[PDB]
Enzyme design. Sequence first.
Site, PDB file in Angstrom:
ATOM      1  N   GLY A  30       0.631  -1.466  -0.207  1.00 28.62           N
ATOM      2  CA  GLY A  30      -0.269   0.252  -0.470  1.00 28.62           C
ATOM      3  C   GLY A  30       0.604   1.062  -0.295  1.00 28.62           C
ATOM      4  CB  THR A  31      -0.843   4.256  -0.084  1.00 32.87           C
ATOM      5  OG1 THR A  31      -0.531   5.092  -1.924  1.00 32.87           O
ATOM      6  CG2 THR A  31       0.612   5.726  -0.196  1.00 32.87           C
ATOM      7  CB  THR A  32       4.131   5.332   2.571  1.00 33.11           C
ATOM      8  OG1 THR A  32       4.805   6.262   3.753  1.00 33.11           O
ATOM      9  CG2 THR A  32       4.957   5.749   1.325  1.00 33.11           C
TER      10      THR A  32
END
Lengths: 244, 241, 232, 241, 6, 236, 241, 196, 250
Positions: A30-32
């Site tokens: 996923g996105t940070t």
Amino acid sequence: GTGYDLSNSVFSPDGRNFQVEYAVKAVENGTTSIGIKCNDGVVFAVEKLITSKLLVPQKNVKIQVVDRHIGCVYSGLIPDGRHLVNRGREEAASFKKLYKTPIPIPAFADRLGQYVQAHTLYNSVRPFGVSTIFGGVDKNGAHLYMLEPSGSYWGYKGAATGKGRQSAKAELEKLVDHHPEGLSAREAVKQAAKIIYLAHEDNKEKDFELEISWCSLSETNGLHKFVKGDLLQEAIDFAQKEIN
Amino acid sequence: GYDRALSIFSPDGHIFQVEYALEAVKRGTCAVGVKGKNCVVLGCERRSTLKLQDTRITPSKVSKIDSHVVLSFSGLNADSRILIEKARVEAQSHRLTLEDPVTVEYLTRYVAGVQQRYTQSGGVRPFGVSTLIAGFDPRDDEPKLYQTEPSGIYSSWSAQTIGRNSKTVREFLEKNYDRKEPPATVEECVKLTVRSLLEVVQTGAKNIEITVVKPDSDIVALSSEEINQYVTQIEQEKQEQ
Amino acid sequence: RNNYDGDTVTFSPTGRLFQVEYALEAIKQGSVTVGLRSNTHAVLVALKRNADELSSYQKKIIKCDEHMGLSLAGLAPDARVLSNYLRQQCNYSSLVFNRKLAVERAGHLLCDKAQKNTQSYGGRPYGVGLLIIGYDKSGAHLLEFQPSGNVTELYGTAIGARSQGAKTYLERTLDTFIKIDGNPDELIKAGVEAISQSLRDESLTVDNLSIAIVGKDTPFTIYDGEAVAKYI
Amino acid sequence: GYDRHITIFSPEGRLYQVEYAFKATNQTNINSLAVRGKDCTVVISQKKVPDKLLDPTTVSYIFCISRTIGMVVNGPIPDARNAALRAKAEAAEFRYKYGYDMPCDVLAKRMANLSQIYTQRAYMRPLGVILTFVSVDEELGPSIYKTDPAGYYVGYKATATGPKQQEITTNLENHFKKSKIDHINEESWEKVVEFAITHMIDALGTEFSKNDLEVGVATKDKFFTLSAENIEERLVAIAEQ
Amino acid sequence: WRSYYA
Amino acid sequence: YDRGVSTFSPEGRLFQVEYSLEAIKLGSTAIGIATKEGVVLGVEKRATSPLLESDSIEKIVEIDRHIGCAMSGLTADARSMIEHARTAAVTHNLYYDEDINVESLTQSVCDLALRFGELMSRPFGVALLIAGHDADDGYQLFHAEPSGTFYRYNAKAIGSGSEGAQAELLNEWHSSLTLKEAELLVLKILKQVMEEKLDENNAQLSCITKQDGFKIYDNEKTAELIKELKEKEAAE
Amino acid sequence: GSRRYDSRTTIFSPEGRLYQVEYALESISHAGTAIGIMASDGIVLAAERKVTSTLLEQDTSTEKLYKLNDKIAVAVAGLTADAEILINTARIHAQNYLKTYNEDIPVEILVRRLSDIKQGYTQHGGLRPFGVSFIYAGYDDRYGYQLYTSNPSGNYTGWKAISVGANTSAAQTLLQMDYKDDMKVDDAIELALKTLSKTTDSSALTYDRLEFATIRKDGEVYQKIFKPQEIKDILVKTGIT
Amino acid sequence: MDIILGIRVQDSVILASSKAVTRGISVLKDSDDKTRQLSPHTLMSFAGEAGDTVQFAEYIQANIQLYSIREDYELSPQAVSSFVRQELAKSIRSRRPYQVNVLIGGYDKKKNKPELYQIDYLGTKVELPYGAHGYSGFYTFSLLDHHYRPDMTTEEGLDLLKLCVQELEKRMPMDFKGVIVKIVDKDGIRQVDDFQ
Amino acid sequence: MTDRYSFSLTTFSPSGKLGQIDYALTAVKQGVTSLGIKATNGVVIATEKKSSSPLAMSETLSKVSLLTPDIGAVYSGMGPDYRVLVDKSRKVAHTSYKRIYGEYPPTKLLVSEVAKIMQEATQSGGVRPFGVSLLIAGHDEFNGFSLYQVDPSGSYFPWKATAIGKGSVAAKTFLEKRWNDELELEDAIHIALLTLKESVEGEFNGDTIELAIIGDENPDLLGYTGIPTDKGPRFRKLTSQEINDRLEAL
Ligand SMILES: [Cl-]
Ligand SMILES: [Cl-]
Ligand SMILES: [Cl-]
Ligand SMILES: [Mg+2]
Ligand SMILES: [Mg+2]
């Protein structure tokens, strides 16, 4: 023997629950996203990959509020995050309806934790595919928390999860050095934008959009609000400068 | 609440649990029914793999549903009771709410419906049973004969047979039943029925049972003595040059 | 994929949910459909598909309220289920609060309805994609629904087989069609062009073209058949 | 799937899932031990905070179940908090229904019984934790009762749990064999805490800082946990022999 | 091959 | 089985649904043809034995006076779909004092098709041609499958002969056909794909007209039509 | 979810047999033999205990012959614990019929319902069958002395003499030899004991490994379950000791 | 207050049941057969609250008929009356109890004895030589107490019954439009067609 | 999130065996030895309190358990299973008997009731059999003293004496030699201690042995006086001292 990773509530012979560990893989892809705790609040920030210039800017919001004082952000399977948040909203309503006081941040952590842990108990459900960073201001301080598909959670000085977690953690460990006497709500907003920008280099492939929110006893009166408008631009600037 | 799908489709479009249920029917004692000009006859085989069994009390293979309708079957016996009960009950409810007994077709359609529900409900297996349902509609003299099978399909027959060795008995019947002139007497209808059980029963009248249904709720089962008269006379028509 | 794709309650050793991925494959076999919006209107164009020369053209667009509607690509039944649930929510909002249901909020509700069917044993994901348009208090809106649960707000997009053609075209035409304000016929024209980049051995006809528009002072309306001649 | 995946017997007569559950109890690599004073009960457990980003004050495996019962968990934190909530509930319900405070041992039995269940019903997994309960019971005096994923529970003169469980147990056995009694004959709980930290150190062969440990004390009146500062005080005294 | 899809 | 009844295959299709489609391919044939003069439904009876009384083979049924239905596949599965349609059409008249629309009634049947999982245990093994008349969209013919989908066809054939029979219809159908033309035309295509030689005993005809509604042709009527076809063909 | 571990217990083999019923029958075939013989003036139940040790107490032991009712008794072959479940539901059903009609339950109606229950575990609910077979010995005011048999499938049939459990093909062959329709009770008693002594898997046939009961004709019907001593006596009288 | 009378002579049982049906102010019917046949040798008559009366009756009927076909056997009269008492005794503590009373007369083809049974809506059951429900007992029990003999012929019974009916016509305020009489004996149930 | 295991976990194999019951027996066989002996005026049941840590307090755990004032139970196998069965057993003796008849259940019937609970774990959905055998001993007025064994299958049988668990075959054979039908209670206690003595390897004393008797009524253990017809209780667990005191006379 073999076979121990196809159902959920199953102990492997070395004591693990592989399906939870596989859920973490969705989180890591996923996105940070991060959290920084300051002297009287918390800041939340997240990376919004601009898949395509076709996305409306500013308009696929990711940080969610719980009640009026709690902020939540997560990395991984977005729809699981909303689900967990929905549950959090119910859990925060139940608590307030009976006890009147809005739910204290640690008490909220255990509400989420207990529920997420619940989804590691039976092979008729799968674990949550999100790690979640959340927190707020209550009758005696600010609190930042992070919660894994296992249901594990602890209180943090700062927290990160997603593709860029390692840059973020490294950059956050730095933050606990310069600025150790304490970090103010405003500086923490700026630092948040820096870290998201730095962490984005493990996703340099796509362009991205910054989104920050905060919850400061002094700057928001204790309520959770989004960093928008002018203060937002100032932090975006502070990121560009400090990255060059 | 156990709801697992037990009857499902396989890639070639088959529902194996229904088909395997038919196999149980093939494994069961033979049953036959013949339409007369003014009657219907039901005949059954008694498996001779046993003895010494009390036949006074072992349940016959022909069961009265209402006083004008009977049902015989091939297949798992225990399953048969469930169908017979549901049907006997529905026979009385029709009388209660409509003030008319069921037609033979209606009662068949009900039994066949119960059979079908058990082929697409979670947690249950199809019935290992096929039925012959025969009798006369109320206030009507045309004999009726229907057959159902585990899948839930039903249709009517001038004569028909089910169970082990039914392939042969249908050949025999297919080459002995003049649709244009069916057995004109009860006495010669039971004869054509006993004859076709003799192709597959070998032998005795304690291994055959007959039941005659005539209009206006006239239902009677023959005794071994009554049946033997056709068994011995059938064997006298035996060659003969 | 081998051992880990028999239900929606099993993660792959790399973090994937195959049952959801196979659901997307159903959309890809669906027929192309396109949505785009300016600051004043939002438009849907869909290519309807037939079975024989003798069959009808499977409808692709469904009104949800006077201000909201969608296009579908994939298992048409699941669109019925989802669009019908969307009608109920639009209607609840109207009746209980005297409030038109925000397009943003319909999006949230859809995501949550679908996510139930990726943590539930005995359920399945939805095998359809939805393009949702509407005009609410914050203007024109276009949403794309994916069976993973992911609902996204865009200026335009396309789903279905060969959809990349239109998607690519909208990415070029972006700065142009955002500005098509107060001229609905010109936004539809824009959409009909975008969807053309996805035809292969077929041209748009009165029988297969299907168009919806909504916007400021223009209740959600659907054009089929002779009505769409104007645009070919 | 096998007799390895769910809680059913293997031909050896074994529940592998209970065994693998036990293995997970050590997955934290933390040891704990508990001893009884004359009129108190002390539990000691290691505290390992490896991340500078963690808030050390929120990292604990010692829980205050009631005013009188403390519980220390050996095993992964999510299952441990799950167990902790359920016990806090069971103890509050006990008080409402029965009118006195729930005894340490009774709660242990009650949680052990719940453990047994996950051992027999297939749809629930065991919890990968071992529960160490301490109180100064109003009837029994100082008390230590322990639960594991098998549904076992028992009371201990003293006890220890974790990867070096064996060395700590054998260490404490020898000291009670030398002293000829079942407890630390010391009237201050501070000294009993020191005994615990001492004999802990001697068996792990490692020294401790004020952040390596976590301490809980149970008196007649209540059960409290020590601060890093109250611990530093204890360690100082240990450093002066 | 099979167009049971809209 | 192994997968689970509601499982998607890796190509995006529901196994149980597509396996259910195979059983229909094995079903006796059924054809319907639409004309501005009415709609015709015909079916192959296909009795198994000669002792089976071919009159009791009921594969065309009435749903309302203005809606008829022809079935093909595992026909036992159709009893409850028919029961539901007849209840749906009658309920609609109870609630609105008007005939139900043919498409609305078709949509209602298709809603059953997907009510299965782990509530029916398996999809239906039978497809339906639903023919009717209403005053909003005139004469109409619909094809409803266990997928839950349905299309409106000017003419359609389902079952064993369908692939070829449908190919024939695609050549032979036009918009100004007459009711009598489609009657013979259905009889034609039937004998073409049937395994028995067609007579008034293994085939059955029926139509729906505004003025008389849904009637099933009795053997006498169909017979006179089969002959009328024998003579027209040919006659070059 | 859990569908992985469901052994489908109510499914058909491709031959149309019921896996668990057949396997349940295999289970029963290793059970102590029990025999039922109907005389012209009574009925005899005899069966063999497979569980025997010096220290086993037999005065207070029952394993095969159970009283259902003042006028009906069963001989059990299979899982005795499964049998007791089935017995009490039967013992109750009998009392329900008595309460409703103020008449004792006719033997077949009780046997029919008990088989109806068994049949159920065969067709729905996903449970295992009952590993039990019953010999019913009863008397009623309509069919007189009756002898029935039921098995895990739920099928039942009536008999002049029959055997269930171990070695039935052997025992059934012996019963066919020496059984006569005109026997008295004491003949059947001896035919019964003499068949067991020829089919026992044991060395010799002793009183401590038998249960025995007879229902026979004052104008009413007495039901007698022999005590160890009464059996020992009957064993000498017939010369087997 | 309809008329439900019953008398058990030596060889048979006789049921007489008023013929009138009055809904308030008008007499709606004068030919009402307040009787159902429970099996070939068992007959039940009934009176009480409207609708409850036949509903209960036909329910008991279909139940006895179901038993007859299932067991190919005809329940004794004692057992039918016991099934009926149990059914009424359940209703009495239910939400809406059946408001029905019954006489049950049958010939026990097994004991070759006739039997008469009186059961009220409460499930009170009694075996009697003669019985009535409602007010009918008040005028007729003195006649029956007097002239009744256990060995009376069916013909003697009919005569004694005629007396009871005339006393009911003299002293009872309601015109009950006469009775229908039915006999249950070794041969089944016949309806006396000439009762003047 | 619910018990989706509606189906049996114990099924017949093609050999006719009920696998899961057999395995439960296996577990019983691994269990520590326990035994019971019936005399003319009492019954005795004993097992080994083999602690699993010398830091454990053996007395905090009773393997001998009072069911009613006249019934005791001991076991071999998985303790946690036994424990929930003792709880269930005490409740049933109330709910299905005391609250109905105002008497405690007689031994055979309570044994029957426990048996039923175990039978059900052999057939109900989503559960394994119990992994224990029980020896239950007690006394009721119309049957006197009695001793019954209950197995994971749900079967029970009555004994003059027997043993279950590890050293059962040895102790069973040992008991068949020394048992007569004229033993007094104190005699059986002796034979009980001796048979256990063989099966035990470590320390063998009154702190490592659990032993109870069903015998005379102890009105000193009643708790109240003044109701002369309330007798009982016949169950009694022996003290640590009472065991050693008899161990010298070994
Ligand atoms: Cl009924
Ligand atoms: Cl907690
Ligand atoms: Cl009344
Ligand atoms: Mg069902
Ligand atoms: Mg009853």
